[PDB]
């Protein structure tokens, strides 16, 4: 009974694909490369709803000319099971059928096929088709073709990562990134930089990742998703190194820029890293994020870790670490947690500084459960130099005195903040006025 | 002006028994057993034994099930007689009686289904609201949060469609009790104050208990001016409090800044709230918030203060006040800093201009984030 | 009760008396406008669904 529903679903999917290729052709004809992004938008939904009949009919109807790619593609696809009501979907008519299809359209269809092959647990042929597509893209040179090649790069890297051959694709990615940078392609630059950072971080080549980040300038006109990926990876690098403040800033920006509804796993990962880096810095993460339905069960070990850090107790911390030791390793924060396990006292010193305007070193030792006040003095001096606490020590009497709070308003800082925001708003208005189209003269 | 069904004192007694301290309360056990004996609650007795690991007095339960079956068959026969000839009215009353007895015996699901069928047949808005109130009271008795929320929304929709203001005020009291349950003390105090002069829901609690609850919620939800104009200067509240020396002392200690007496009153109120079933979940949050409120009230009129003076005012030691102030300043509640070498409590209340600048930065950053996201999404 | 604008300095046995413009009435209006325009941007978000 569901066969008829599947067939009508396939027909509507074919209509959607035809609309997509029409949009690509319109983009190429009108010299408006950004149009192809409209078709590329529905890539996840189309991948979800793809089927054998859909792919076979699409390729047959869209590869009348240049049948070499049909020869390379069809064998991977499965023949329809004795189809008798075939309508012989023929989108290209007469002159259109005779003429060779466009490079962007061929790339899009190849991309659909590789995505389907990947979704199915058959990665070898996915890699083969991907390599063929990449050869085609390298041979060609166009703008809309580059826009499609961005997603092609993403899925090529994905299939190789599934294969566990991420290292070999590194040189391929570097070469393509160089070509894109020479050709001034922001989308390709962003996608390739994100994929390269992922490659490095997979094998823990943090020095290489840092060098590439320092020497490459991320495109400003990049999609919010690419910005989120880049911010997350840079924050990961800075957190693995000792740049906790910058890591927290960048990763808050990444979580802010991530899509609101989807990207649940990315949100969980960024949230865990943010919790750990905040604990290292000595603050206390907000508790609202610990009860969201999506991020509820995942962050429980980190909830317990925050509990122990706040009520600093090495017994509880070690218990939590021993219990959830393996999950920290799986999620990629065990080393940072190990650092926290020894810099825990920083949080206590921060709370003491926040509460007390002037306290004795003996009292600080008593509150921090330390040994003789010499250790407390050394810890406080370390914190002051690190900038965690704005206080000055005075041993001629033997107390730590917190610095005064300066009147920020009388300073020029509000002027700078407001100027930044004014410039941002003016740029937004200018670009929103330039985005307008008046089409009747077409 | 509504039936005492389900009897919420039963829920109170069950909670008292569930509490570890009073699980051996012979008197409470006798009172609960007497109530269940009189009302013939076989499902509730079964559930209570299952939950408390109590021996089943099968001798009583036998006759009790006998009476329950007798009454149920009577009600079914009367319903059948009604539907045979009588048109409406009598059949609705039959279903109401059946469901009421089922609730009185304790069958949650049977009672809920009976009330749903009765509501489906009923067309009078008053009777519909009465059914919704019965369901809301069952949800309160069994702390069924989803049922409570759904029935509250249904009652609100009915009142919007049109209904008596008496039922409106009753719904206000019900909403207030639910708000106290889910820790929305601001709305609880608002509704209780609005209904202090229009209280007709004696089905849920006594008027003295209602005024005590209103006082408790008000002193935590209302600033000093509102507490002055509404609670302390409230004629009805004062009239009722005239018979409650403890609650009057608790309120007036805070109002008049007699802090030792206020701390004593909060100490007794903590035990009262912990024993009370509605407040028991939030019996520490309320105490902590009241302590923070008292400390902030004392500090609101002092640039500098001495820990010895604070300890004398609160009738405590210096170390206790030091711990409390440190904890609350760290949590960010009290605006002050503690100087220990010289025991001073210098106040650090923020400047309005600077607070406004920070708030503007934060809110404008959120808005600009959203505007940038919209601009980006417009083209992609 | 805000009868007079002043603050007590215990220990030193002093009473400080000052005059304060506690509020600007421009920052508050700006904040309210920011909230209202946040609502407007939410409505624009809803309206942009037609573009998709």
């Amino acid at each position: 009974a569901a066969e008829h529903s599947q067939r009508e679903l396939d027909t509507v999917t074919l209509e959607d694909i035809k609309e997509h290729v029409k949009q690509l052709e319109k983009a190429v004809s009108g010299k408006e490369p950004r149009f192809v992004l409209r078709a590329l938008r529905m890539l996840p939904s189309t991948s979800r709803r793809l089927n054998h009949y859909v792919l076979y009919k699409a390729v047959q109807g869209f590869f009348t000319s240049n049948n070499a790619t049909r020869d390379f593609l069809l064998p991977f696809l499965e023949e329809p099971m004795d189809t008798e009501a075939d309508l012989q979907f023929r989108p290209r008519t007469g002159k259109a059928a005779s003429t060779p299809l466009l490079p962007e359209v061929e790339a899009y269809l190849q991309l659909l096929v590789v995505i389907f092959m990947m979704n199915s647990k058959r990665y070898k042929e996915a890699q083969k088709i991907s390599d063929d597509l990449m050869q085609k893209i390298s041979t060609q040179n166009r703008r809309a073709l580059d826009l499609v090649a961005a997603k092609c790069y993403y899925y090529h890297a994905r299939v190789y990562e599934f294969l566990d051959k991420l290292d070999v694709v590194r040189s391929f990615l570097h070469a393509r990134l160089r070509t894109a940078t020479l050709r001034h392609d922001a989308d390709g630059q962003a996608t390739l930089l994100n994929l390269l950072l992922r490659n490095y971080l997979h094998y823990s080549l943090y020095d290489q990742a840092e060098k590439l980040v320092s020497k490459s300038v991320f495109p400003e006109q990049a999609n919010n998703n690419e910005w989120a990926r880049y911010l997350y990876y840079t924050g990961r690098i800075k957190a693995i190194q000792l740049e906790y403040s910058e890591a927290r800033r960048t990763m808050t920006n990444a979580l802010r820029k991530a899509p609101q509804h989807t990207a649940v796993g990315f949100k969980q990962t960024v949230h865990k890293l943010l919790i750990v880096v905040e604990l290292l810095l000595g603050e206390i993460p907000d508790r609202l994020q610990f009860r969201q339905p999506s991020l509820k069960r995942s962050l429980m070990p980190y909830f317990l870790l925050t509990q122990a850090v706040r009520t600093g107790n090495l017994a509880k911390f070690n218990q939590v670490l021993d219990q959830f030791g393996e999950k920290f390793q799986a999620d990629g924060t065990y080393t940072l947690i190990i650092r926290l396990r020894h810099n825990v006292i920083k949080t206590g010193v921060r709370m003491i500084s926040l509460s007390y305007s002037r306290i004795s070193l003996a009292d600080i030792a008593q509150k921090l459960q330390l040994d003789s006040p010499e250790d407390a003095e050394f810890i406080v001096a370390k914190a002051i130099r690190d900038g965690v606490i704005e206080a000055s020590i005075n041993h001629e009497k033997g107390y730590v005195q917190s610095k005064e709070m300066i009147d920020i308003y009388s300073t020029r800082e509000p002027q700078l903040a407001f100027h930044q925001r004014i410039s941002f708003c003016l740029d937004i208005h200018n670009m929103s006025v330039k985005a307008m189209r008046f089409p009747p003269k077409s | 002006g509504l039936p005492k069904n389900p009897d919420l004192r039963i829920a109170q007694l069950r909670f008292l028994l569930s509490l570890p301290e009073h699980r051996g309360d012979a008197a409470v056990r006798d009172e609960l057993m007497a109530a269940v004996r009189d009302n013939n609650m076989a499902p509730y007795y079964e559930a209570l034994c299952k939950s408390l690991d109590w021996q089943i007095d099968v001798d009583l339960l036998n006759k009790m099930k006998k009476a329950n079956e007798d009454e149920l068959k009577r009600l079914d026969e009367e319903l059948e007689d009604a539907e045979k000839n009588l048109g409406e009215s009598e059949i609705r009353d039959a279903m109401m009686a059946k469901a009421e007895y089922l609730c009185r015996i304790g069958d949650k699901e049977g009672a809920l289904t009976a009330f749903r069928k009765t509501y489906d047949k009923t067309v009078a808005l008053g009777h519909r609201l009465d059914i919704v109130f019965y369901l809301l009271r069952i949800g309160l008795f069994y702390m069924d949060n989803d049922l409570i929320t759904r029935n509250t929304e249904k009652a609100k929709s009915l009142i919007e469609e049109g209904g008596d203001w008496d039922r409106r005020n009753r719904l206000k009291v019900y909403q207030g009790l639910y708000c106290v349950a889910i820790r929305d003390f601001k709305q609880a105090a608002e509704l209780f104050l609005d209904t202090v002069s229009t209280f007709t829901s004696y089905e849920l609690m006594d008027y003295k208990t209602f005024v005590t609850y209103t006082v408790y919620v008000s002193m935590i939800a209302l600033e000093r001016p509102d507490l002055r104009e509404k609670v302390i200067k409230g004629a009805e509240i004062l009239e009722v409090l005239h018979s409650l020396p403890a609650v009057r002392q608790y309120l007036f200690s805070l109002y008049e800044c007699r802090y030792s007496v206020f701390f004593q009153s909060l100490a007794v109120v903590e035990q009262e709230m912990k024993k009370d079933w509605l407040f028991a979940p939030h019996y520490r949050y309320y105490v902590r918030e009241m302590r923070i409120h008292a400390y902030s009230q004392l500090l609101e009129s002092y640039r500098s203060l001495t820990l010895g003076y604070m300890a004398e005012a609160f009738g405590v030691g210096v170390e206790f006040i030091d711990q409390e102030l440190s904890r609350f300043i760290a949590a960010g509640r009290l605006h002050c800093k503690i100087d220990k070498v010289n025991e001073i409590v210098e106040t650090n209340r923020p400047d309005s201009k600077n607070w406004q600048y920070q708030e503007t930065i934060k809110k404008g950053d959120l808005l600009l984030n959203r505007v940038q996201k919209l601009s980006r999404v417009i083209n992609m | 009760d805000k009868k007079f604008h002043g603050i007590l300095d215990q220990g030193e046995g002093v009473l400080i008396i000052f005059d304060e413009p506690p509020v600007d009435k421009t920052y508050e209006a700006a904040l309210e406008t920011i909230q209202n325009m946040s609502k407007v941007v939410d409505s624009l978000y809803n309206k942009a669904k037609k573009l998709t």
Partner: peptide
């Protein structure tokens, strides 16, 4: 800054309206 924010929101509103109009016109012509 508040004035500039108002200006930006108005510009976004105009862009959304223009895009709606163009998309509707293209759909009708198609």
């Amino acid at each position: 800054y508040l004035a500039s924010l108002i200006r930006s929101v108005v510009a976004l509103h105009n862009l959304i309206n223009n895009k709606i109009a163009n998309r509707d016109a293209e759909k009708k012509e198609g």
